[PDB]
Amino acid sequence: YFNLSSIRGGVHPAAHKDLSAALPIGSLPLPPRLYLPLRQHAGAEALPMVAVGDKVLKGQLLAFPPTEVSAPVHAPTSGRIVAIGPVPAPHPSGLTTTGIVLESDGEDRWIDLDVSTDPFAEDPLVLADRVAKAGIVGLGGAIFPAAVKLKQGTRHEIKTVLVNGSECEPYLTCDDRIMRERAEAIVDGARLIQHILRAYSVVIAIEDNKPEALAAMRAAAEHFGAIEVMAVPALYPMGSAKQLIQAVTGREVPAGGRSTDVGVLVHNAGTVYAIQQALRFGRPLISRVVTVSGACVKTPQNLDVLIGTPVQALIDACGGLSGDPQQLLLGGPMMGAVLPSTEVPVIKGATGLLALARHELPNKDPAPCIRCASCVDACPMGLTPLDMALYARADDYDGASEYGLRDCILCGCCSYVCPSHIPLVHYFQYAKGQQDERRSAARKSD
Amino acid sequence: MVAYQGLSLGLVCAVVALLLLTGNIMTHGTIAEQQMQDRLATLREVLPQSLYDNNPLADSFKVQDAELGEVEVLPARLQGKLTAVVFQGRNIGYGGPIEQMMSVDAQGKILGVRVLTHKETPGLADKIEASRSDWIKVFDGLSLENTALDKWKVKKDGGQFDQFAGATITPRAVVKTVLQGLQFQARHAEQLKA
Amino acid sequence: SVAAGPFAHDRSSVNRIMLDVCLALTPATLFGLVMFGWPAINLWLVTCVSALAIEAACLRLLGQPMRRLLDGSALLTGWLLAISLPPWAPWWIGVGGSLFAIGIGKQLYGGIGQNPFNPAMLARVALLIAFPLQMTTWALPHPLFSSSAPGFFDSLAITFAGAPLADGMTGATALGNLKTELTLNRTAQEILEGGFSTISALFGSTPGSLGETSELLLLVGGVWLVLRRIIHWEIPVAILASVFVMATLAYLINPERYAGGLYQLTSGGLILCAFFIATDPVTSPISRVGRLIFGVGCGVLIYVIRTWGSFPEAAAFAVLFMNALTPLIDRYWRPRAYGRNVRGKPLVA
Amino acid sequence: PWQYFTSALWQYNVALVQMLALCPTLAVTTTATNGLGMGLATTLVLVMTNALISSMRHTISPEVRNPVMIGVIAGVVTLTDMAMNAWMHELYKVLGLFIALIVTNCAVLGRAESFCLRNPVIPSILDGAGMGAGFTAVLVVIGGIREILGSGTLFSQASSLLGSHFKWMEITVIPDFQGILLAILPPGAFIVLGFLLAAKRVIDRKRAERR
Amino acid sequence: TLDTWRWDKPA
Amino acid sequence: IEATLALTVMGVLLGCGLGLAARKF
Amino acid sequence: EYVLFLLGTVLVHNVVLVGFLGLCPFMGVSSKLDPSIGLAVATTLVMGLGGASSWLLEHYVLLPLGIGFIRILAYIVVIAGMVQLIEMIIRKASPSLYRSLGIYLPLITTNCAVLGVPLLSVREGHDLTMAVLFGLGSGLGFSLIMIIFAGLRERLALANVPAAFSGPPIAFVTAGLLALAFMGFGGLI
Ligand SMILES: CCCCCCCCCCCCCCCCCCCC(=O)O[C@H](COC(=O)CCCCCCCCCCCCCC)COP(=O)(O)OCCN
Ligand SMILES: CCCCCCCCCCCCO[C@@H]1O[C@H](CO)[C@@H](O[C@H]2O[C@H](CO)[C@@H](O)[C@H](O)[C@H]2O)[C@H](O)[C@H]1O
Ligand SMILES: CCCCCCCCCCCCO[C@@H]1O[C@H](CO)[C@@H](O[C@H]2O[C@H](CO)[C@@H](O)[C@H](O)[C@H]2O)[C@H](O)[C@H]1O
Ligand SMILES: CCCCCCCCCCCCO[C@@H]1O[C@H](CO)[C@@H](O[C@H]2O[C@H](CO)[C@@H](O)[C@H](O)[C@H]2O)[C@H](O)[C@H]1O
Ligand SMILES: CCCCCCCCCCCCO[C@@H]1O[C@H](CO)[C@@H](O[C@H]2O[C@H](CO)[C@@H](O)[C@H](O)[C@H]2O)[C@H](O)[C@H]1O
Ligand SMILES: CCCCCCCCCCCCO[C@@H]1O[C@H](CO)[C@@H](O[C@H]2O[C@H](CO)[C@@H](O)[C@H](O)[C@H]2O)[C@H](O)[C@H]1O
Ligand SMILES: CCCCCCCCCCCCO[C@@H]1O[C@H](CO)[C@@H](O[C@H]2O[C@H](CO)[C@@H](O)[C@H](O)[C@H]2O)[C@H](O)[C@H]1O
Ligand SMILES: CCCCCCCCCCCCO[C@@H]1O[C@H](CO)[C@@H](O[C@H]2O[C@H](CO)[C@@H](O)[C@H](O)[C@H]2O)[C@H](O)[C@H]1O
Ligand SMILES: CCCCCCCCCCCCO[C@@H]1O[C@H](CO)[C@@H](O[C@H]2O[C@H](CO)[C@@H](O)[C@H](O)[C@H]2O)[C@H](O)[C@H]1O
Ligand SMILES: CCCCCCCCCCCCO[C@@H]1O[C@H](CO)[C@@H](O[C@H]2O[C@H](CO)[C@@H](O)[C@H](O)[C@H]2O)[C@H](O)[C@H]1O
Ligand SMILES: CCCCCCCCCCCCO[C@@H]1O[C@H](CO)[C@@H](O[C@H]2O[C@H](CO)[C@@H](O)[C@H](O)[C@H]2O)[C@H](O)[C@H]1O
Ligand SMILES: CCCCCCCCCCCCO[C@@H]1O[C@H](CO)[C@@H](O[C@H]2O[C@H](CO)[C@@H](O)[C@H](O)[C@H]2O)[C@H](O)[C@H]1O
Ligand SMILES: CCCCCCCCCCCCO[C@@H]1O[C@H](CO)[C@@H](O[C@H]2O[C@H](CO)[C@@H](O)[C@H](O)[C@H]2O)[C@H](O)[C@H]1O
Ligand SMILES: Cc1cc2nc3c(=O)[nH]c(=O)nc-3n(C[C@H](O)[C@H](O)[C@H](O)COP(=O)(O)O)c2cc1C
Ligand SMILES: Cc1cc2nc3c(=O)[nH]c(=O)nc-3n(C[C@H](O)[C@H](O)[C@H](O)CO)c2cc1C
Ligand code: SF4
Ligand code: SF4
Ligand code: FES
């Protein structure tokens, strides 16, 4: 503890968190139809179990995992299946994907949940498989199944459960409100995780730019001992698992290794809240919290949205587009993607619905690199982005891999501090995609 | 096999050596003449033909002094009588030592000064060469009796000799060499003065 | 085509950097121009205009967009070359230097960010080598509006054409005077007692280059540049520390032969080279240890060629040598990654 | 057999296409007359060596192929030196070491080892003559482009170096010119050579596009 | 398809 | 003469050395 | 002292920038750093041994017998011979060693530097120790220049050099500028 800070890089972008983190979490009227993609997680894609025209209740297991590394899909609301086919996906390409379409009946009747009894009584494996049959996908961006992470963590020895409450992305305030209003729930979820993984204490960390969240967390968790609330600095690449681990524990996650090596596990606050809900009440992951902000939105807010709700309904709920949105990002400005259209659904990993106007989007006129070395002074991983970009532009991906293309996390600190405006992150993404394509080809060859 | 590998190499070396020897026996003669003629051409630029009769590069002296060390005085005798003596002087300049030649007559009057070797920066102190400026031709009537030991310096130090625009170290070295040569001739009488 | 992130920026630009560097150079350039007068102004104007025009022509030939002219990469080089030249120099000296730098040194390699050598110092070295007489004629300070400096048309005849200046308007500086007097079998103390004052040399009351003369306004500009986070303190700190330490050691060893410390600092283009010229981003290391090595080597070479060399100042030569050595330093002193040791293999825990 | 002569001048140049024999190209080039003299000496030695090797082609055991040939080359070089030290001493003093440094001339040995071993005497001789004319052309173009920039004058002291009969080549360009000193110096050689290489590239591309 | 979609090199 | 014999000796020494080296290695 | 002589040979009297010796392999192999380093080490070793052997032959065979005009021939022959040996003995006695020194040895057999340096030594009339030091200095200067020009050419391989100058012409221009930068060391030693 007693954070080492360091980080060895980082930027201070405009937070813009004061225009949305005022109102409480709103609610959505039930939209007519929901589009649920069958791949809302990492790894394999779940297989459907219902047919067209079937009647399902709120919480039914529409799709099941084909392998260990997957996650089921649960019906957000009671209704009738109308399509098991192609649906638009929340991807920059705009291509379609396999997915179900559910017509909202409007009754909104819950299924007979399999509630547990005395959650602090059972062995860790039973709780882990209960989480597995809950749809938890780790709503922090990595969309990785929480059950696999917990099962792997139980194998080793864990000395600390680190709740990643440091929402660092600009314009995003979902974590702030979810921690202000659900402090008891997040503390109980942290306790349940600490029981699942035999550990010592939880070190729940929040950034210093959220005094209300810190006060609420400290008020909620002061009678139970090992629970701790920590104040990390206000840095952009601070929510990352590796950077937060280095800041709190003081060690470094070895390259090509997992967080369990240093005996620390990282979970987002929304993921821990979902785990707490699943363990205490048996409710699967059906809805989450998203942040709608930007200069083109009449009323920025945080909305509790069902999975599969179209983006257009979300925009209409918050008043409407008060002008022409130059960009419609899905997530923070440093990692968001351009939405092809407003009919795209909301996957479990969707974090924001930013509507950036012209005055918020900086102009960029690319120029030759002047080798000012401002990239090296901002990279959290201590790489040399200029050399990586030079080798990627020359199609020498092998040379770029030597300079740190393997360890890059695409945080976007490169292009933020570039005098001659260069899309360094675009180069890195293109090089990684080319490496993945070559790897796929050569693997198929075998 | 080993037959070719050594036989052909030895044969090449032997035949080529023989041909080179046949060339040497012819060219060794004519190369010495060319080098001696080059030496005479360099010497003649400061010594007019009428003054000397015998061959200057046949009776070269070797004189020890107290400062310069060993000298290479070449006499120029018309009829058993010394008329001019040609020697060389060395002095540290800016880019390195400067080797110049002096051809001073039997009465102490300088008959001409030429700079043989120098490594000064071109375009700034290259005027010492007689093919670029007439400055080196200043020492043509001066001696140790019409110029006391106050005018044998550049104008910067209070003398009578002009200095190059932007370069004074090289003229200082040349004037010092000329003065030292004249004083060396004055010290060693008879065999150098007559 | 789809657009990639991030969608945020810090409003930085190359134009702002170059304009800030020019603004930092302005207080010393004004002091230099006022002290020497109209010929200095004419030389500076000619050098800057020639730099801009030749950059425009080179951009037109190579096909690059004309917006590259507006980033200040050529105006800064012209400014540095003009302030690095003798004050009362002919126009063709400045024009030739500008053509040799913007051209061979910068545009022949592709443009900004591609050249491996410093353009301004390359032009200065080429001018010194090609024309030694015109680059070693230092005019005494003749302040503007002083009743002794030439008028506005006499100064035009001085700068353009070839009218000889005067008998008595040209003197010797400090380093060259010290070396000459040492070659005149005088000890290294008598020379500095009656031929050098530190207070006047620090203010800038001595003959020298156009902007080199003042070692205080340059220091203020460099400090402001460091506080603006445009340059890194490693190179200036290393250069100044190395030169001062070597000079002090030499003075302590042989006081009657070596002069060091204040004399070495307040003489020549050491401060200007350390702050504004050796900190060229395109031709400097990108690491911290690399920058420290760059600065230490620059200082050592500058002092070595100053003391035992054949030049009175070798800031340009040291900078060019270290620019040549830069790529090896870049490829052998890369910063440590995350979760890896210095050698690069993964950490063990 | 004349086709090789017409091809070795521009299509395959010893120092402009094959990137060989750069030491004499860059060192003895300060005057056009020096370049012409070096080029002609190299042409003479090339012709003689090539002819001798072609005549003695049917042997030269491959395992010892290098030194043997070097031997022959060395002979024709050494004799050459001892000729021009005895009857062209004024030219010999200027060239100095590089007249002796023809044994290691990469172009000479490469052409010897690449053509002479598989061709008759006359094609060998013609090839050598073409290579030497190409070398001479390069050493005259670079020599002139450096001399003009350094002093303004074209071929100079030809009456002394190459004999009074070649006085007619003494022509002055840009009278009343002090010249740029950098062209004579070593930095002036590499830049001029690079510019000539780029000009050759450009003219070749223009011809190819016209084709 | 989506799994075969990859980024285009920046201009 | 005393020179050609030395030249031939050095030549045959080099030839025998290279031949023995090629044979053994 | 010997340190001043070595430094002067390396910097003040560099065999390439102000000597114009061994330019063809220097401009043909410097595209890649590892071959440049290998050839630099190999040529340093070869030039040192060649200088030592040339001095021994000149002061023990050529001069006592009265024949000097054969010198060039003798020198090259000996050096060539030696190089061949230094090559083939490396092949299988240390097979791992034939990846950094042996592969590049064929080149330096005829380099104009292994021949240039000994003749220059001959002109100055150096002794055995001085000749060996001169050879090693010339070698360490050839290295110091190749292992510095390779870096620049590799930096420029990834640059944006115009299509009319990419490759050899830009290398020649960079070499000219590097010689103009080395010119500052003149007269220091
Ligand atoms: C005139 C005497 C000057 C004396 C003083 C000179 C002092 C300064 C020297 C400056 C020389 C010029 C520097 C500017 C070069 C700009 C290059 C622009 C880009 C480029 O490569 O353009 C190409 C140049 O033409 C070529 O590639 C052809 C070039 C042919 C050169 C022939 C002259 C050889 C002699 C040079 C001696 C210099 C000595 C200097 C001491 C043609 O455009 P591109 O094909 O790249 O277009 C691509 C678009 N698609
Ligand atoms: C990369 C770091 C290199 C560190 C180098 C440190 C060694 C250099 C300094 C010690 C040598 C000082 O060298 C001393 O100075 C003078 C010039 O002042 C050198 O040079 C002097 O002699 C040479 C040879 O004749 C000529 O150029 C001229 O006469 C003069 O310049 C001398 O050889 C020596 O007397
Ligand atoms: C891009 C275009 C070129 C810009 C750079 C050149 C600017 C003009 C420089 C011209 C220089 C000519 O050089 C100088 O000319 C001026 C007038 O100009 C002459 O001046 C002459 O006319 C002026 C009035 O016009 C009189 O006051 C003066 O007494 C008389 O001498 C100078 O005697 C001469 O030394
Ligand atoms: C990018 C900026 C470039 C700036 C270029 C400026 C070029 C200026 C050229 C100056 C010309 C020579 O300068 C001039 O020389 C001549 C004779 O030599 C004399 O001047 C005489 O001829 C010039 C024309 O050449 C007439 O303008 C002048 O009235 C007359 O007196 C003066 O000395 C000086 O006016
Ligand atoms: C090598 C790096 C620098 C590259 C240099 C590019 C070449 C630039 C020109 C160099 C010319 C050198 O030659 C130089 O010619 C100029 C004309 O311009 C002559 O100049 C003469 O006439 C001009 C008018 O035109 C007057 O301004 C000048 O005062 C007078 O001397 C110089 O007396 C001579 O020294
Ligand atoms: C931005 C607006 C303008 C700001 C600049 C205001 C002017 C500043 C520059 C003034 C410089 C001239 O001022 C001074 O003039 C005198 C003679 O007059 C010169 O001559 C002398 O002055 C100094 C004064 O200490 C003497 O010690 C010294 O022996 C000698 O250099 C100086 O070298 C020069 O420094
Ligand atoms: C009497 C003559 C004295 C000449 C002095 C010349 C020294 C030049 C530099 C002056 C000092 C500048 O002061 C400098 O301020 C910067 C402001 O970011 C500090 O900060 C600097 O280092 C820190 C780490 O230590 C970095 O994280 C930071 O990015 C960098 O800017 C430096 O630690 C300090 O060295
Ligand atoms: C390595 C990084 C730099 C370290 C610091 C470098 C400082 C500058 C170099 C200092 C060099 C001193 O150089 C050396 O000075 C000594 C002084 O003892 C001179 O020595 C001379 O004077 C001393 C007394 O002072 C006599 O006893 C001695 O017999 C005589 O030779 C040497 O001839 C000279 O070689
Ligand atoms: C710049 C940042 C790094 C600073 C590092 C400081 C480390 C060294 C500290 C001890 C330095 C002592 O430095 C000492 O100062 C004296 C004045 O007292 C200076 O000496 C000064 O006055 C003497 C006469 O008194 C003059 O002959 C001399 O030219 C002048 O510089 C010298 O430079 C040095 O002899
Ligand atoms: C021509 C003159 C040349 C001058 C050359 C100067 C010597 C340079 C070579 C020796 C360098 C040794 O470089 C070695 O690098 C390691 C990292 O690998 C440094 O390690 C450390 O350096 C600095 C210490 O200030 C820290 O800020 C840095 O974070 C850390 O890496 C060691 O402190 C240093 O010993
Ligand atoms: C790596 C960094 C190393 C820094 C340098 C440290 C070593 C410095 C050695 C030089 C020490 C002084 O060494 C010696 O000093 C003498 C007298 O003092 C000076 O004086 C020299 O000048 C003349 C010509 O100017 C020379 O011909 C002569 O050899 C010598 O007298 C020279 O500079 C140097 O020959
Ligand atoms: C952006 C750059 C703009 C460049 C503008 C240049 C304008 C001036 C053109 C160059 C100077 C022409 O001025 C020149 O003057 C000299 C005498 O001084 C005379 O020229 C004479 O000397 C010059 C010296 O280089 C040579 O051309 C030649 O030896 C002879 O013609 C001519 O009058 C004219 O060639
Ligand atoms: C890595 C870079 C290293 C730089 C070089 C190391 C410093 C070298 C300094 C050499 C200084 C030469 O200094 C000059 O030379 C002579 C001999 O040549 C020195 O002489 C000194 O060393 C010689 C040789 O060991 C002794 O015999 C002598 O008693 C002593 O005085 C003088 O002090 C000076 O006149
Ligand atoms: C650039 C970047 C930004 C990140 N921002 C956050 C964040 O704001 N909140 C968070 O919890 N994790 C953040 N992370 C890390 C992961 O999203 C998450 O912490 C971990 O990988 C999986 O946690 P989960 O299992 O709780 O989803 C970030 C990572 C990177 C690389
Ligand atoms: C801090 C700093 C220093 C600079 N120094 C120089 C310099 O010495 N010479 C130069 O031509 N440009 C200099 N520039 C301008 C820029 O670096 C120049 O365009 C590149 O060297 C061109 O390749 C400098 C710019 C900055 C920001
Ligand atoms: S995107 Fe990759 S290279 Fe760039 S700063 Fe982030 S981790 Fe470093
Ligand atoms: S920030 Fe931009 S200009 Fe600076 S080194 Fe990195 S890529 Fe180059
Ligand atoms: S290396 Fe000298 S000619 Fe090839």
G24 CA to middle of ligand 18, Å? Answer: 5
Cβ neighbours of residue B9 closer than 8 Å, sequence gap 6 or more: D64, D67, D68, D71, F11, F12, F14, F15
**Residue B80 shares a structural domain with residue B126:** yes
The tokens for D166 are: 């070649």
| Residue at C6 is within a domain | no
| Residue at B108 is within a domain | yes
| Lookup result for tokens 């060596």 | D49
Q: Is residue B25 a known part of a binding site?
A: no
Interface with E, mutate which of A38, A40, A91, A93 (most E CBs under 10 A) = A93
Residue G173 Cβ inside 6 Å of ligand 13? The answer reads: no
| Residue at C135 is within a domain | yes
B105 forms bridges with which residues in the sheet? B84
**Residue C162 shares a structural domain with residue C182:** no
Exposure pattern of C206-240 as b/e (b: 16+ CB <10 Å)? bbbbbbbbbbebbbebbeebbeeebbbbbbbbbbb
Which residues of chain D does B8 touch, with a Cβ-Cβ cutoff of 8 Å? 59-61, 64, 68
Distance CA C124, CA C316 (A): 7
Query: Are A289 and A303 within 8 A, CB to CB?
Result: yes
CA-nearest residue to D187 within chain C is C126
Sort strands A26-27 and A301-306 into parallel, antiparallel or unpaired. Answer: parallel
The tokens for C179 are: 């070396």
Q: Chain centroid to CA A350: how far?
A: 7
- CA-nearest of G110, G126, G31, G24 to G75 is G110
**DSSP classification of residue A104:** E
- CA-nearest of G136, G84, G132, G138 to G116 is G138
- CA-nearest of C269, C203, C238, C279 to C21 is C279
Phi–psi pair at G152, nearest 5 degrees: -65, -45
How far, CA to CA in Å, does G90 sit from each of A105, F18, G107?
A: 85, 14, 15
| Residue at B49 is within a domain | no
The DSSP line for D111-169 is HHHHTGGGS-HHHHHHHHHHHHHHHHHHHHHHHHHHHHHHHSBSS-SHHHHT-GGGGGG
Provide the shortest C-alpha distance from residue A433 to chain E (in Å). Answer: 6
Query: Are C320 and G152 within 8 A, CB to CB?
Result: no
Q: Is residue B92 a known part of a binding site?
A: no
Distance CA A233, CA A209 (A): 8
Distance CA B55, CA A337 (A): 99
- Domain span at residue A431? 385-445
Provide the shortest C-alpha distance from residue A437 to chain E (in Å). Answer: 8
- Where do the H-state alpha helices sit in chain B? 2-44, 169-187
Residue C244 Cβ inside 6 Å of ligand 9? The answer reads: yes
The tokens for B163 are: 């200095």
Cis peptide before C6 (omega within 30 of 0): yes
Query: What one-letter code names the amino acid at A63?
Result: A
| Residue at C151 is within a domain | yes
Cβ neighbours of residue A300 closer than 8 Å, sequence gap 6 or more: A19, A20, A291, A292, A293, A294, A318
Cβ neighbours of residue C101 closer than 8 Å, sequence gap 6 or more: C51, C77, C81, C119, C120, C122, C123
- Count of domains for chain C: 2
Query: Are B86 and B102 within 8 A, CB to CB?
Result: yes
| Residue at B95 is within a domain | yes
Which residues of chain G does B96 touch, with a Cβ-Cβ cutoff of 8 Å? 187
**Residue C52 shares a structural domain with residue C177:** no
Cβ neighbours, 10 Å, residue B148: 8
Region of C262 please: left (phi>0), alpha (psi -120 to 50) or beta: alpha
Distance CA A258, CA C318 (A): 48
**Residue C326 shares a structural domain with residue C178:** yes
Residue D62 Cβ inside 6 Å of ligand 12? The answer reads: no
Q: Chain centroid to CA C99: how far?
A: 18
| Lookup result for tokens 């993607």 | A337
- CA-nearest of A311, A303, A269, A265 to A287 is A303
The tokens for G2 are: 């010997």
The DSSP line for chain G is -HHHHHHIIIIIT-TTTTT--SHHHHHHHTTSHHHHHHHHHHHHHHHHHHHHHHHHHIIIIIHHHT--TTHHHHHHHHHHHHHHHHHHHHHHHSGGGTTTTTTTHHHHTS-SHHHHHHHHHHHHT--HHHHHHHHHHHHHHHHHHHHHHHHHHHHHHTS---TTTTTHHHHHHHHHHHHHHHGGGTT--
Q: Which of A222, A249, A281 is the last residue of a domain?
A: A281
- CA-nearest of B183, B193, B190 to B65 is B183
Cβ neighbours, 10 Å, residue A440: 12
Q: Secondary structure of chain C in the HEC alphabet? A: CCCCCCCCCCCCCHHHHHHHHHHHHHHHHHHHHHHHCHHHHHHHHHHHHHHHHHHHHHHHHHCCCHHHHHHCHHHHHHHHHHHCCCCCCCHHHHHHHHHHHHHHHCCCCCCCCCCCCCHHHHHHHHHHHHCCCCCCCCECCCCCCCCCCCCHHHHHHHHCCCCCCCCCCECCCCHHHHHHHHHCCCCCCHHHHHHCCHHHHHHCCCCCCCCCCCCCHHHHHHHHHHHCCCCCCHHHHHHHHHHHHHHHHHHHHCCCCCCCCHHHHCCCCHHHHHHHHCCCHHHCCCCCHHHHHHHHHHHHHHHHHHHHCCCCCCHHHHHHHHHHHHHHHHHHCCCCCCCECCCCCECCC
- Three-state DSSP at D25 gives helix
Query: Are D19 and D201 within 8 A, CB to CB?
Result: no
Query: Are A72 and A45 within 8 A, CB to CB?
Result: no
- CA-nearest of A6, A64, A438 to C338 is A6
Query: Are A333 and A294 within 8 A, CB to CB?
Result: no
**DSSP classification of residue A402:** I
Count the alpha carbons within 13 Å of A411 in the hemisphere toward its beta carbon.
Answer: 30
| Residue at G66 is within a domain | yes
| Residue at C341 is within a domain | no
The tokens for C345 are: 């293999």
| Lookup result for tokens 């079937």 | A54
- Three-state DSSP at B88 gives strand
Q: Chain centroid to CA C294: how far?
A: 16
The angle formed by the CA atoms of residues G35, G39 and G40, to the nearest 5 degrees, is 115
| Residue at G186 is within a domain | no
Q: Chain centroid to CA A178: how far?
A: 14
| Lookup result for tokens 């070649």 | D166
| Residue at B193 is within a domain | no
- Three-state DSSP at B74 gives strand
**Residue C126 shares a structural domain with residue C236:** no
| Residue at G69 is within a domain | yes
What atom in ligand 1 is closest to the CA of residue D149?
Answer: 4
Query: Are A25 and A98 within 8 A, CB to CB?
Result: no
Distance CA D9, CA A319 (A): 81
| Residue at B192 is within a domain | no
Residue C261 Cβ inside 6 Å of ligand 9? The answer reads: yes
**Residue C144 shares a structural domain with residue C194:** no
Phi–psi pair at B170, nearest 5 degrees: -65, -45
Count the alpha carbons within 13 Å of G40 in the hemisphere toward its beta carbon.
Answer: 22
Provide the shortest C-alpha distance from residue C180 to chain B (in Å). Answer: 8
Region of A32 please: left (phi>0), alpha (psi -120 to 50) or beta: alpha
Phi–psi pair at C346, nearest 5 degrees: -60, 145
CA-nearest residue to C125 within chain D is D182
Nearest-10 crossing angle of helices C217-227, C14-36: 170
- Where do the H-state alpha helices sit in A108-145? 124-132
| E strand or H helix at D46 | helix D32-55
Distance CA C107, CA G164 (A): 13
Distance CA G19, CA G139 (A): 12
**Residue B32 shares a structural domain with residue B86:** no
- Domain span at residue B171? 56-187
- Three-state DSSP at D87 gives helix
Distance CA G144, CA G133 (A): 16
**DSSP classification of residue A46:** P
Domain ranges across chain D: 2-210
The tokens for C8 are: 């945020």
Query: Are G39 and G142 within 8 A, CB to CB?
Result: no
**Residue A124 shares a structural domain with residue A268:** yes
Q: Is residue G57 a known part of a binding site?
A: no
Nearest-10 crossing angle of helices A269-281, A124-132: 110
Q: Chain centroid to CA C128: how far?
A: 14
Phi–psi pair at C286, nearest 5 degrees: -95, -10
Region of C164 please: left (phi>0), alpha (psi -120 to 50) or beta: beta
Interchain pair D198, G164: CB under 8 A: yes
| Residue at A411 is within a domain | yes
Cβ neighbours of residue D209 closer than 8 Å, sequence gap 6 or more: none
> Resolution in angstroms for this experimental structure?
3.2
| Residue at A365 is within a domain | no
Q: Chain centroid to CA C13: how far?
A: 23
**Residue C24 shares a structural domain with residue C70:** yes
- Three-state DSSP at B49 gives coil
What atom in ligand 13 is closest to the CA of residue G1?
Answer: 18
Residues having CB closer than 6 A to ligand 14 are A 138, 140-142, 144, 146, 164, 167-169, 237, 239-241, 266-268, 271, 335, 409, 411
- CA-nearest of C119, C22, C118, C15 to C67 is C15
- Count of domains for chain F: 1
Q: Name the experiment that determined this structure.
A: cryo-EM
Of C77, C212, C225, best ligand 15 pocket probe by most atoms within 8 Å of the beta carbon: C77
Provide the shortest C-alpha distance from residue G75 to chain D (in Å). Answer: 10
Residue D175 Cβ inside 6 Å of ligand 12? The answer reads: yes
- CA-nearest of B78, B80, B85, B79 to B106 is B85
Terminus-to-terminus CA distance in chain A, angstroms?
48
- CA-nearest of C171, C172, C265 to C218 is C265
The beta-carbon neighbor of C110 closest among G147, G162, G184 is: G162
| Residue at C246 is within a domain | yes
Interchain pair C338, A381: CB under 8 A: yes
Query: Are C319 and C118 within 8 A, CB to CB?
Result: yes
Which chains are adjacent to chain G, needing at least 3 Cβ pairs under 8 Å? A, B, C, D, F
Q: Is residue B168 a known part of a binding site?
A: yes
Provide the shortest C-alpha distance from residue G138 to chain D (in Å). Answer: 16
Burial group, residue A29, by CB count within 10 angstroms (0-12, 13-18, 19+): exposed
A96 forms bridges with which residues in the sheet? A88
G–D touching, 3+ CB–CB pairs within 8 Å: yes
Distance CA C75, CA C71 (A): 9
Residues having CB closer than 6 A to ligand 2 are B 95-96; C 304, 308, 310; G 4, 7, 187-189
Query: Are G40 and G147 within 8 A, CB to CB?
Result: yes
Q: What is the dihedral of CA B11, B15, B20, B21, to 10 degrees?
A: 110
Interchain pair A430, E1: CB under 8 A: no
Burial group, residue B58, by CB count within 10 angstroms (0-12, 13-18, 19+): exposed
B–E touching, 3+ CB–CB pairs within 8 Å: no
The tokens for C69 are: 């002219």
State the ligand closest to the CA atom of C180: 11
CA-nearest residue to A386 within chain C is C286
CA-nearest residue to A392 within chain E is E9
- Count of domains for chain G: 1
Cβ neighbours, 10 Å, residue C63: 7
- Domain span at residue G88? 2-181
- Count of domains for chain B: 2
| Residue at G175 is within a domain | yes
Which chains are adjacent to chain B, needing at least 3 Cβ pairs under 8 Å? C, D, F, G
Which residues of chain B does D68 touch, with a Cβ-Cβ cutoff of 8 Å? 8-9, 12
CA-nearest residue to G114 within chain D is D104
Interchain pair F14, D63: CB under 8 A: no
Cβ neighbours of residue A331 closer than 8 Å, sequence gap 6 or more: A141, A169, A172, A337, A350, A351, A352, A354
C231 CA to middle of ligand 12, Å? Answer: 42
Query: What one-letter code names the amino acid at A285?
Result: L
Q: Secondary structure of G147-186 in the HEC alphabet? A: HHHHHHHHHHHCCCCCCCCCCHHHHHHHHHHHHHHHHHHC
B–G touching, 3+ CB–CB pairs within 8 Å: yes
How far, CA to CA in Å, does G188 sit from each of B93, B167, C173, D129, G8?
A: 14, 19, 21, 45, 8
The DSSP line for A168-208 is -STT--HHHHHHHH-HHHHHHHHHHHHHHTT-S-B--EEET
Query: What one-letter code names the amino acid at G172?
Result: F
Distance CA D116, CA A228 (A): 88
Query: Are C107 and A368 within 8 A, CB to CB?
Result: no
Burial group, residue G87, by CB count within 10 angstroms (0-12, 13-18, 19+): buried
A80 forms bridges with which residues in the sheet? A55, A103
A338 forms bridges with which residues in the sheet? A329
Terminus-to-terminus CA distance in chain E, angstroms?
24
Query: What one-letter code names the amino acid at A219?
Result: A
The tokens for D13 are: 């140049």
Sort strands A79-83 and A73-74 into parallel, antiparallel or unpaired. Answer: unpaired
**Residue B22 shares a structural domain with residue B77:** no
The tokens for D162 are: 């190459």
Residue C30 Cβ inside 6 Å of ligand 8? The answer reads: no
Of C35, C36, C170, C210, best ligand 6 pocket probe by most atoms within 8 Å of the beta carbon: C35
Query: Are G150 and G178 within 8 A, CB to CB?
Result: no
Q: Which residue minimizes the CA distance to atom 18 of ligand 15? A: C73
Phi–psi pair at A83, nearest 5 degrees: -160, 140
Q: Which residue minimizes the CA distance to atom 30 of ligand 5? A: C162
Distance CA C234, CA C291 (A): 6
Residue C217 Cβ inside 6 Å of ligand 6? The answer reads: no
Residue D23 Cβ inside 6 Å of ligand 18? The answer reads: yes
Cβ neighbours of residue B189 closer than 8 Å, sequence gap 6 or more: none
C117 CA to middle of ligand 2, Å? Answer: 26
Looking at chain F, the number of H-run helices and the number of E-run strands are 1, 0
- Domain span at residue C293? 173-206+215-333
| E strand or H helix at A64 | strand A61-64
Exposure pattern of A309-338 as b/e (b: 16+ CB <10 Å)? bbbebbbebbeebeeebbbbbbbbbbbbbb
Query: Are G139 and G43 within 8 A, CB to CB?
Result: yes
Q: Which residue minimizes the CA distance to atom 5 of ligand 11? A: C304
Cβ neighbours of residue B12 closer than 8 Å, sequence gap 6 or more: D68, D71, D72, F11
G–E touching, 3+ CB–CB pairs within 8 Å: no
Query: Are A272 and A139 within 8 A, CB to CB?
Result: no
Q: Which residue minimizes the CA distance to atom 8 of ligand 16? A: A379
Distance CA C275, CA C268 (A): 13
